[PDB]
């Protein structure tokens, strides 16, 4: 009976974002998003595939891909149409013989697993438009004598951000152990291993102004390089930053789930 029922697969879209806000007059920014598409298969689908080399063709589509600059499909397992010019959509077909062998090896390698993951695609998106960055940063710096002051405004914006919260939000300002007369609003911790100031921020949401925007600052004295840079860290789930999405083509398979997650890489605000 297993032969005739529609078979489930699952997809995962993972994206990392690097950003730099220069500061100064125009506070120009650069954004780079790097993404990965993985597909998962239930362990029992091997026995179906090994037993039937004629198994029907698993086919899928990428959608809302206008924002993606470059694709690297897995050429071991996938086919495509180079004659497909559609800018917002692209189709891929599995090689079912290679896919079968690939899962057989995965099973042979890990007989205990209940599912097996397969890497379909790598991709990249770059922009100088801050509208691609979910969290807008503006840092400023001033120095009078031995006193340095640093401030950061952050803005989580509905025009920029996907619809979801940014969580595990941290702001990192590196500061040497020779600094004295520390003032921070709001309060921050100083991590001695990494030598940096740490702010932990509440989750941020584009939905509400008070929930989404804020400011913070610190000052110190140094008896004695370039202006300091602040690093921001956060995480999200339920949306992609690029806008890319995946859907199956045909009814023979069905998508059990699509997991979407993103995280900051190096995500920075500099000040002049």
């Amino acid at each position: 009976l297993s032969a005739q029922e529609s078979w489930p697969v699952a997809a995962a879209i993972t994206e990392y974002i690097n950003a730099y806000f220069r500061g100064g007059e125009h506070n120009r920014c650069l954004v780079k998003i790097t993404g990965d598409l993985t597909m998962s298969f239930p362990a029992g689908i091997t026995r179906i595939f090994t037993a039937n080399p004629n198994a029907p063709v698993l086919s899928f589509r990428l959608v809302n891909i206008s924002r993606v600059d470059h694709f690297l499909p897995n050429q071991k397992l996938l086919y495509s149409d180079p004659s497909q010019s559609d800018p917002d959509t692209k189709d891929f077909w599995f090689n079912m013989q290679a896919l079968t062998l690939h899962l057989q090896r995965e099973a042979e390698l890990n007989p205990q697993a209940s599912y097996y993951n397969v890497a379909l695609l790598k991709y990249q998106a770059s922009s100088q438009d801050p509208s691609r960055a979910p969290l807008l940063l503006s840092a400023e710096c001033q120095r009078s004598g031995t006193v340095t002051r640093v401030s950061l405004d952050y803005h989580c914006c509905p025009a920029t951000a996907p619809a979801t919260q940014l969580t595990s939000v941290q702001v990192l300002l590196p500061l040497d152990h020779s600094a004295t007369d520390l003032q921070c609003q709001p309060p921050a911790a100083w991590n001695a291993e990494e030598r940096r100031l740490l702010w932990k921020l509440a989750n941020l949401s584009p939905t509400n102004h008070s929930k989404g925007s804020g400011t913070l600052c610190a000052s110190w004295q140094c008896l004695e390089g370039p202006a300091p840079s602040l690093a921001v860290q956060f995480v999200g789930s339920g949306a992609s930053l690029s806008g890319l999405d995946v859907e199956l083509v045909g009814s023979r398979y069905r998508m059990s789930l699509v997991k979407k997650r993103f995280a900051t890489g190096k995500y920075m605000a500099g000040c002049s």
């Binding site: 078979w7 995962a12 993972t14 998962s40 599912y115 993951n117 995280a263």
Partner: peptide, 18 residues
Amino acid sequence: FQSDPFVGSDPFKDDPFG
């Protein structure tokens, strides 16, 4: 953010398949 995006949590656990 480990390399297994399903983080050891079977996405098919509740699926009617099989």
